[PDB]
Amino acid sequence: DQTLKMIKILSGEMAIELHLQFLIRNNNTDLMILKNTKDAVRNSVCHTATVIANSFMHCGTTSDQFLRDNLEWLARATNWAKFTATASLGVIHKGHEKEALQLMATYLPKDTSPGSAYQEGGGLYALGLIHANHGGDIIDYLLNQLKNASNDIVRHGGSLGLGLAAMGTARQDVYDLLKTNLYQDDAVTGEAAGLALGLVMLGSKNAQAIEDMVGYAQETQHEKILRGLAVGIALVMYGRMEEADALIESLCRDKDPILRRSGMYTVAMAYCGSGNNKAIRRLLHVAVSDVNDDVRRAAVESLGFILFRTPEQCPSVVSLLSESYNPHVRYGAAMALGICCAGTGNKEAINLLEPMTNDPVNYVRQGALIASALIMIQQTEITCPKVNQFRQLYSKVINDKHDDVMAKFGAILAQGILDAGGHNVTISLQSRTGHTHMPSVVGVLVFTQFWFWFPLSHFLSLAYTPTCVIGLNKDLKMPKVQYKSNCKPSTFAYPAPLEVPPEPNFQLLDNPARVMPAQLKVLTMPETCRYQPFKPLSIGGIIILKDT
Amino acid sequence: AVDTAEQVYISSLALLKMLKHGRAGVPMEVMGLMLGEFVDDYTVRVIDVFAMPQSGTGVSVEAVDPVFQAKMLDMLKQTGRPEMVVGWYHSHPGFGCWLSGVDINTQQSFEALSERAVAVVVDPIQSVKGKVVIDAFRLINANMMVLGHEPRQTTSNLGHLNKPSIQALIHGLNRHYYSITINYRKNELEQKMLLNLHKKSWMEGLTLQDYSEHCKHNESVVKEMLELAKNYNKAVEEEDKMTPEQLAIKNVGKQDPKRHLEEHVDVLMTSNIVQCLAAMLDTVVFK
Amino acid sequence: GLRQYYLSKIEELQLIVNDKSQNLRRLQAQRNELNAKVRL
Amino acid sequence: DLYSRYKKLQQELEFLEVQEEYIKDEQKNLKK
Amino acid sequence: HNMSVKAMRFPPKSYNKDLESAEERREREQQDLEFAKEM
Ligand SMILES: [Zn+2]
């Protein structure tokens, strides 16, 4: 009703559990792939790589069999891979209130009490992963446990998951234990405090809190505390276009390379998608003048974030920088492509990324594979032929013995990136309205910083967005529509695994039906059905389907 | 455990101590002590280094006298400020950097004292400007090598950034010790007072530079510049001839007039114009 | 008035395109030789 | 369309202006 | 002199790849260096 209307449209659950319905009904994944990557048994990053890869390709589908296949190779690596193990569960159970506490009923920190306070500590991380942008009992339940706990072995998970659930909410309550979390004088609380300290104050420009943060990041001696805040003071200002330039000028004026880097980020967030002359002069000049490599890499990775609106311009400027003398600019160049053109199958950008795996530096070979994953998600051989040209390539590098673990790390990560959600989720830094999707923007921005923390780029679940229509007539009732398409039916290709031990263009589609955004224009309206949509079917998502 | 993201900070003075004491007695493996604040599980900040005199003749590492470092530890205690010994070093002179069997013994005598002691190798020959070459190390347990288990549990893309040298790879490299990425701490308080003081003329360009011999030296370049230009009237004429790659390999026995010419044009040019302008300012300034 | 007003903007701008693009094409190859010298 | 034919064409004059200054910076930086 | 500089920088064109050395020879150098390190 109109009384129920605030719950229907403001809690917005009938896209949460209904896209969750689309995930639990639509699942096109493989066991054989992780059987092929199972062979790489060594105590390197590989364990965390696989157990983050299946979480990448099983976002929100609640499928526990790639973990429940074993316990030994799962819990083989220790002391942070169990923290990553309890991290990876909430992405699998993303967007679902019920199967959060009850499946982690083993994994509460007070039930079994093993010698791993990480396996039991990092649960609230994953609870924040499930209930990001859903502030409820997650706030005070994930807050009063943080009033009294151990040191920063559970406080990382509760802090990150807590600020993640309270992301962009301006809450004094979490701001209190974020104050005393900030003033611990502890090194290991830096990622715990400086991240959520910005997360709860997204776009707030609370200049007293800015003065607290940059006033705090000028005297300590540890660097992780100088890094989480270096993300947070970027995060507090968002889309301002002029309202930070004195502060950007201050941070770039400072001698601290980490703080200049943080200014790079901050100017990367105050200019999202806006092709401004004011940002692009200094920003590009900071990646040419400055002497630290980190600020050069963030300086060139600001470009897709400020210029994802027109993806035709970043291949024109960054290919000029693919051949720099340093592999740092050669690396953030490739990730600048990977953040700019990731929504499209840009044949020119793939053409740029073709020799980027050839370079004699391991990490630019790596980020070549990450950007190569981001350019072609949900694209099957007809948007661009390079898809299966690279499917053999990720196997080609992952099945070598003589490569680097870092070299194959972008491939094993790029698997779960490339086949994410059973070809049902996608990245979108952009709504159809023209408005950008700022949790996806935060997800890719935080996703950049796997240099200094590995489950830091586990924050990618906010970028995974559907490509699916939903037909609907009431608040709840499914109709039964079957419309088709008109154009070439080979666009509708699937992964179709091989499993080694006369052309219909009428793709009949139900209500929870996946459809490519390129395939939104090639479909056919239902004209002979009893149900006929009152909205012109241009966007997917969810619509009213009027019973005629 | 560690995450191969240890990130040793050092100094701006200890590098100078290492190159000076490592250079003065350079063919013998000299050594000494390291002295700084031991910050958290990841990082360490070694602010000071004092060296130790040797035991006798012989290329090795001698020994350590706790009488001597007990006293020297207290000289700065009652004069400057207290610090803590954190590491130590020696000097592979013109070798590169690794751990010898003698090095790993005296390391092993130090890690039992403090588990996060630091081995440091200076190489004061193969350094020129941008290649200082230190690569601080520390032992890994061979027990886990017997276990066949991989230590050090990478949680950060910070370790595998520098590729190891092939000679240390021949040595104990990855079976007995690990590398540590390091960097330096500096400030404009130092940067200005070393930049503004290293190469400074005083009033020298406000002179006239041997005013008889200026024009005489000008003659003393132009005179052979004539015959060198005659060789430029010799070397052009074998073009419209054999290929310029043969006109590249073929010119490795005898001089060319081209590059040798444009050298002397520059030398005469900048030699003259400075003496001209510097000659003419003093006419205004002095009366 | 859009003929004699609006179309006259296009004939002007293209002349700046044709030579500033050309100066750019000279200038970036002028980088590129030096860059190959550096990495070589 | 006729109206975008000038807006999008001055747009790449703004966008085009930066790069000559950019390679002007690289021209000395690769020397140094 | 300066006009003889300005109207002669055209040449640098056409040719576009300065390869570092190779890829497969870099891999074989890693294999032979791995055998010298094993020796
Ligand atoms: Zn030695």
XYZ file of N, CA and C in Angstrom, chain A residues 241-354:
342
model
N 34.189 18.948 -7.268
C 34.556 19.680 -8.482
C 35.352 20.959 -8.237
N 35.260 21.541 -7.043
C 36.099 22.674 -6.681
C 36.393 22.669 -5.192
N 35.609 21.911 -4.432
C 35.507 22.142 -2.999
C 36.604 21.466 -2.208
N 37.619 20.943 -2.878
C 38.740 20.325 -2.207
C 40.082 20.876 -2.644
N 40.118 21.759 -3.652
C 41.344 22.058 -4.395
C 42.418 22.709 -3.529
N 42.014 23.433 -2.486
C 42.981 23.916 -1.509
C 43.581 22.759 -0.722
N 42.773 21.741 -0.432
C 43.272 20.606 0.328
C 44.101 19.674 -0.541
N 43.696 19.482 -1.802
C 44.501 18.750 -2.775
C 45.840 19.434 -2.954
N 45.806 20.762 -3.058
C 47.012 21.565 -3.174
C 47.871 21.464 -1.921
N 47.239 21.296 -0.757
C 47.990 21.125 0.480
C 48.682 19.771 0.530
N 47.943 18.698 0.230
C 48.503 17.354 0.314
C 49.582 17.138 -0.730
N 49.368 17.644 -1.945
C 50.420 17.602 -2.949
C 51.570 18.527 -2.579
N 51.284 19.602 -1.841
C 52.349 20.485 -1.384
C 53.233 19.810 -0.337
N 52.678 18.886 0.452
C 53.447 18.234 1.508
C 54.545 17.348 0.926
N 55.613 17.178 1.709
C 56.751 16.370 1.298
C 56.470 14.877 1.368
N 55.436 14.468 2.093
C 55.141 13.056 2.297
C 54.663 12.438 0.992
N 55.357 11.428 0.459
C 54.889 10.796 -0.783
C 53.578 10.060 -0.612
N 53.351 9.475 0.563
C 52.105 8.766 0.827
C 50.951 9.754 0.890
N 51.198 10.935 1.443
C 50.131 11.913 1.554
C 49.873 12.627 0.234
N 50.912 12.824 -0.582
C 50.695 13.296 -1.947
C 49.893 12.282 -2.747
N 50.225 11.002 -2.573
C 49.460 9.903 -3.151
C 48.006 9.948 -2.706
N 47.782 10.260 -1.431
C 46.430 10.370 -0.908
C 45.707 11.568 -1.497
N 46.445 12.642 -1.776
C 45.877 13.744 -2.524
C 45.502 13.347 -3.933
N 46.281 12.447 -4.525
C 46.002 11.996 -5.876
C 44.648 11.323 -5.864
N 44.459 10.463 -4.875
C 43.218 9.734 -4.712
C 42.069 10.691 -4.471
N 42.303 11.663 -3.599
C 41.253 12.591 -3.211
C 40.785 13.403 -4.409
N 41.727 13.849 -5.243
C 41.360 14.490 -6.495
C 40.813 13.462 -7.477
N 41.109 12.177 -7.269
C 40.469 11.155 -8.082
C 39.014 10.955 -7.684
N 38.653 11.282 -6.446
C 37.271 11.103 -6.021
C 36.433 12.365 -6.108
N 37.047 13.538 -6.091
C 36.271 14.759 -6.234
C 35.940 15.085 -7.682
N 36.333 14.233 -8.626
C 36.184 14.507 -10.050
C 35.741 13.258 -10.792
N 34.813 12.503 -10.207
C 34.419 11.213 -10.762
C 33.630 11.388 -12.054
N 34.178 10.861 -13.147
C 33.543 10.903 -14.445
C 33.523 12.249 -15.128
N 34.029 13.296 -14.493
C 33.956 14.644 -15.030
C 35.261 14.972 -15.740
N 35.184 15.179 -17.050
C 36.360 15.511 -17.827
C 36.792 16.950 -17.651
N 37.361 17.266 -16.495
C 37.687 18.644 -16.177
C 39.125 18.973 -16.534
N 39.306 20.157 -17.119
C 40.635 20.663 -17.422
C 41.434 20.939 -16.159
N 40.758 21.288 -15.063
C 41.454 21.663 -13.837
C 42.152 20.467 -13.203
N 41.500 19.307 -13.202
C 42.124 18.118 -12.638
C 43.230 17.588 -13.534
N 43.012 17.612 -14.850
C 43.853 16.853 -15.769
C 45.228 17.470 -15.972
N 45.410 18.757 -15.670
C 46.714 19.372 -15.887
C 47.712 18.920 -14.833
N 47.387 19.227 -13.582
C 48.217 18.868 -12.442
C 48.291 17.357 -12.260
N 47.142 16.695 -12.359
C 47.073 15.248 -12.196
C 48.050 14.532 -13.113
N 48.059 14.914 -14.385
C 48.966 14.304 -15.347
C 50.399 14.756 -15.098
N 50.556 15.971 -14.586
C 51.876 16.510 -14.294
C 52.488 15.861 -13.060
N 51.640 15.362 -12.162
C 52.108 14.709 -10.942
C 52.651 13.310 -11.212
N 52.233 12.713 -12.324
C 52.705 11.391 -12.706
C 53.947 11.500 -13.592
N 54.326 12.729 -13.928
C 55.498 12.976 -14.747
C 56.614 13.600 -13.916
N 56.265 14.473 -12.974
C 57.302 15.076 -12.154
C 57.756 14.221 -10.982
N 56.848 13.509 -10.317
C 57.139 13.077 -8.958
C 58.059 11.856 -8.948
N 58.723 11.662 -7.808
C 59.865 10.763 -7.714
C 59.489 9.427 -7.084
N 58.475 9.408 -6.224
C 57.976 8.129 -5.750
C 57.180 7.459 -6.858
N 57.251 6.138 -6.896
C 56.537 5.388 -7.913
C 55.080 5.158 -7.561
N 54.758 5.132 -6.267
C 53.396 4.859 -5.828
C 52.462 5.983 -6.235
N 52.904 7.222 -6.029
C 52.118 8.386 -6.396
C 52.026 8.514 -7.912
N 53.008 7.982 -8.643
C 52.883 7.932 -10.091
C 51.836 6.911 -10.500
N 51.771 5.783 -9.787
C 50.813 4.744 -10.150
C 49.385 5.152 -9.818
N 49.161 5.745 -8.645
C 47.830 6.266 -8.357
C 47.508 7.460 -9.242
N 48.538 8.232 -9.599
C 48.374 9.397 -10.456
C 47.916 9.012 -11.853
N 48.370 7.872 -12.364
C 47.866 7.421 -13.653
C 46.619 6.560 -13.512
N 46.353 6.015 -12.329
C 45.111 5.291 -12.111
C 43.972 6.184 -11.649
N 44.171 7.495 -11.608
C 43.044 8.399 -11.424
C 42.249 8.607 -12.707
N 42.818 8.234 -13.851
C 42.340 8.717 -15.140
C 41.061 8.023 -15.584
N 40.969 6.706 -15.398
C 39.727 6.023 -15.709
C 38.615 6.386 -14.751
N 38.970 6.765 -13.523
C 37.967 7.186 -12.556
C 37.438 8.573 -12.869
N 38.273 9.449 -13.428
C 37.770 10.757 -13.825
C 37.263 10.773 -15.256
N 37.468 9.699 -16.016
C 37.150 9.692 -17.439
C 36.496 8.392 -17.880
N 35.727 7.746 -17.005
C 34.955 6.599 -17.467
C 33.698 7.011 -18.220
N 33.365 8.303 -18.218
C 32.195 8.787 -18.940
C 32.376 8.627 -20.441
N 33.510 9.073 -20.967
C 33.882 8.753 -22.338
C 35.041 7.762 -22.361
N 34.779 6.476 -22.593
C 35.864 5.500 -22.727
C 36.624 5.573 -24.040
N 36.326 6.535 -24.906
C 37.062 6.691 -26.146
C 38.349 7.476 -25.974
N 38.551 8.103 -24.820
C 39.667 9.021 -24.665
C 40.832 8.430 -23.887
N 40.568 7.536 -22.945
C 41.657 6.922 -22.189
C 42.570 6.001 -23.006
N 42.093 5.192 -23.970
C 43.059 4.543 -24.874
C 43.841 5.516 -25.735
N 43.324 6.718 -25.969
C 44.075 7.699 -26.734
C 45.192 8.350 -25.930
N 45.143 8.305 -24.601
C 46.136 9.037 -23.822
C 47.062 8.089 -23.079
N 46.566 6.907 -22.733
C 47.335 6.033 -21.864
C 48.232 5.095 -22.668
N 47.846 4.763 -23.906
C 48.717 4.015 -24.813
C 50.005 4.761 -25.111
N 49.954 6.087 -25.058
C 51.146 6.911 -25.068
C 52.015 6.665 -23.840
N 51.435 6.136 -22.763
C 52.142 5.876 -21.523
C 52.310 4.403 -21.223
N 51.942 3.529 -22.150
C 52.213 2.115 -21.965
C 53.688 1.789 -22.116
N 54.471 2.690 -22.693
C 55.881 2.460 -22.961
C 56.763 3.411 -22.166
N 56.400 3.661 -20.913
C 57.248 4.467 -20.059
C 58.494 3.683 -19.666
N 59.501 4.416 -19.190
C 60.739 3.777 -18.766
C 60.556 2.975 -17.486
N 59.524 3.273 -16.697
C 59.358 2.470 -15.500
C 58.126 1.567 -15.581
N 58.229 0.349 -15.034
C 57.082 -0.569 -15.027
C 55.968 -0.149 -14.093
N 56.191 0.869 -13.276
C 55.137 1.400 -12.435
C 54.119 2.167 -13.260
N 54.592 3.110 -14.071
C 53.704 3.803 -14.992
C 53.209 2.841 -16.063
N 54.044 1.860 -16.441
C 53.564 0.821 -17.351
C 52.512 -0.076 -16.705
N 52.424 -0.077 -15.377
C 51.485 -0.941 -14.670
C 50.163 -0.233 -14.404
N 50.229 0.934 -13.763
C 49.042 1.739 -13.561
C 48.432 2.262 -14.842
N 49.208 2.295 -15.928
C 48.637 2.527 -17.246
C 47.643 1.430 -17.614
N 48.063 0.173 -17.464
C 47.205 -0.952 -17.816
C 46.010 -1.045 -16.882
N 46.206 -0.734 -15.601
C 45.047 -0.693 -14.723
C 44.169 0.519 -14.984
N 44.707 1.565 -15.609
C 43.864 2.686 -16.007
C 42.959 2.304 -17.170
N 43.477 1.516 -18.123
C 42.586 0.898 -19.108
C 41.559 0.006 -18.431
N 42.017 -0.827 -17.493
C 41.162 -1.795 -16.834
C 40.078 -1.190 -15.972
N 40.253 0.050 -15.525
C 39.168 0.737 -14.845
C 38.354 1.603 -15.795
N 38.922 2.027 -16.925
C 38.134 2.866 -17.816
C 37.167 2.043 -18.652
N 37.688 1.159 -19.498
C 36.866 0.568 -20.542
C 36.267 -0.770 -20.139
N 36.175 -1.048 -18.835
C 35.795 -2.379 -18.372
C 34.342 -2.714 -18.687
N 33.488 -1.703 -18.846
C 32.113 -1.966 -19.220
C 31.943 -2.419 -20.653
N 32.870 -2.057 -21.533
C 32.753 -2.340 -22.953
C 33.783 -3.373 -23.380
N 33.509 -4.023 -24.503
C 34.516 -4.831 -25.151
C 35.286 -3.993 -26.146
N 36.071 -3.043 -25.642
C 36.807 -2.118 -26.495
C 37.912 -2.886 -27.204
N 37.705 -3.104 -28.504
C 38.664 -3.807 -29.348
C 40.001 -3.083 -29.387
N 39.967 -1.751 -29.333
C 41.197 -0.976 -29.281
C 41.921 -1.175 -27.957
N 41.178 -1.256 -26.851
C 41.823 -1.436 -25.555
C 42.393 -2.837 -25.397
N 41.705 -3.845 -25.936
C 42.264 -5.192 -25.984
C 43.501 -5.215 -26.869
N 43.465 -4.456 -27.970
C 44.623 -4.308 -28.842
C 45.797 -3.676 -28.105
N 45.522 -2.770 -27.170
C 46.593 -2.226 -26.349
C 47.079 -3.238 -25.326
N 46.172 -4.041 -24.781
C 46.536 -4.991 -23.742
C 47.155 -6.267 -24.286
N 47.192 -6.431 -25.611
C 47.799 -7.630 -26.189
C 49.296 -7.755 -25.896
